[PDB]
């Protein structure tokens, strides 16, 4: 929950004399390190099957790099989150060059406008938007148009000397 990584985390119930070879289960977990991701895993699995971490074991944990990290993508993001008075589901769209960068900006948005801290957010699904025109949210659509050019008016240049000898300009 700092600067984000994706992990394939594979774990299983402990084997018993009754049942050797219990089924492996995999989750993709967005976390800041392996200790959180491993812990994050058991959090959801205890929300799904009957397992504790005490009763189970983790088979593998592996980082997942973006396959096309310099390729701009449009992402669908499905989020469940508790709010102050209730817990609800959301679809958001994020345009970025990886899933990590997109989850990185996902949690900020859920913090900024919904006041939702990490602990109160589940990421249900994050997938790439296959085509354009399947893009729903309009704040992404603006940057999908053909031959897209815009200015950046009112340039403010950080100074260094604390006194400056001319009236500055913003002209860019």
């Amino acid at each position: 929950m700092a600067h984000f990584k994706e992990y394939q985390v594979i774990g299983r119930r402990l084997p018993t004399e009754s049942v050797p070879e219990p089924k492996l289960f995999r989750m993709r977990i967005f976390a800041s390190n392996e200790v959180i991701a491993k812990s994050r895993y058991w959090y959801f699995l205890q929300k799904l099957h009957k397992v504790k971490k005490a009763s189970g074991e983790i088979v593998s944990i592996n980082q997942i790099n973006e396959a096309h990290p310099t390729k701009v993508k449009n992402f669908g993001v499905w989020v469940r989150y508790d709010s102050r008075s209730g817990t609800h589901n959301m679809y958001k769209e994020i345009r970025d060059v990886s899933r990590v960068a997109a989850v990185e900006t996902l949690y900020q948005d859920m913090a900024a406008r919904h006041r939702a801290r990490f602990r109160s957010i589940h990421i249900l699904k994050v997938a790439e938007i296959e085509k354009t025109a399947d893009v729903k949210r309009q704040y992404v659509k603006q940057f999908l148009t053909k031959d897209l050019k815009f200015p950046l008016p009112h340039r403010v240049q950080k100074s260094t000397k604390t006194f400056s000898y001319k009236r500055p300009s913003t002209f860019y």
């Binding site: 704040y139 603006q142 940057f143 815009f150 200015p151 008016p153």
Partner: protein
């Protein structure tokens, strides 16, 4: 959500000049010349040709974008007024006491005078705003047309007159006495 570009256009009819620098708009036309100071809005004017100007707002919010269109409307009315011009008409409506309206001047002033309103002995006086002209009508009873190239000056100068007789202390539903704006229109291109 901060839209990245939104713009509107301003029709510039044949034989009208529009000079806009440092967001100070000048509009020269057949009727005269009008200016406006738009410095109080961030907006960007582009002149596409002598008949067309665009007003753009880059990466605007909902409230910023709202100011865009009204810039266009403000320049537009500046244009239509320097060409067609504006004409505002009013009607004295009085149930008993005739509302006595004239034009009077004090030290090169020219105020509109209002006498006998609702039986008053007081004399109401509204200054005639600069550049707006007052003429009473021959063929309609109780008219006093107000006309000029600025909607804003003609409309207010009308409403200065309209308000100065408001019937205080009586039921307004019953006492409808006053001078109300009957018709809004143009000087030329009919009316």
């Amino acid at each position: 959500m901060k839209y990245i570009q939104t713009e509107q256009q301003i029709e510039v009819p044949e034989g009208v000049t529009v000079s806009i620098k440092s967001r100070i708009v000048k509009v020269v036309g057949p009727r005269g010349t009008l200016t406006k100071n738009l410095k109080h809005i961030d907006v960007t004017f582009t002149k596409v040709n002598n008949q067309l100007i665009k007003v753009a707002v880059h990466n605007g919010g909902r409230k910023h974008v709202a100011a865009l269109r009204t810039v266009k409307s403000l320049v537009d009315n500046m244009i239509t007024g320097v060409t067609k011009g504006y004409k505002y008409k009013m009607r004295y409506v009085y149930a008993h006491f005739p509302i006595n309206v004239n034009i009077v001047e004090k030290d090169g002033a020219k105020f509109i005078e209002v006498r006998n309103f609702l039986g008053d002995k007081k004399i109401r006086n509204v200054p005639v705003r600069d550049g707006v002209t007052i003429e009473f009508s021959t063929n309609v009873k109780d008219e006093i047309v107000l006309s000029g190239n600025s909607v804003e000056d003609v409309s207010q100068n009308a409403a200065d007159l309209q308000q100065i007789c408001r019937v205080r202390n009586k039921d307004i539903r019953k006492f409808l006495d006053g001078i109300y704006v009957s018709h809004k229109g143009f000087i030329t291109e009919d009316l």
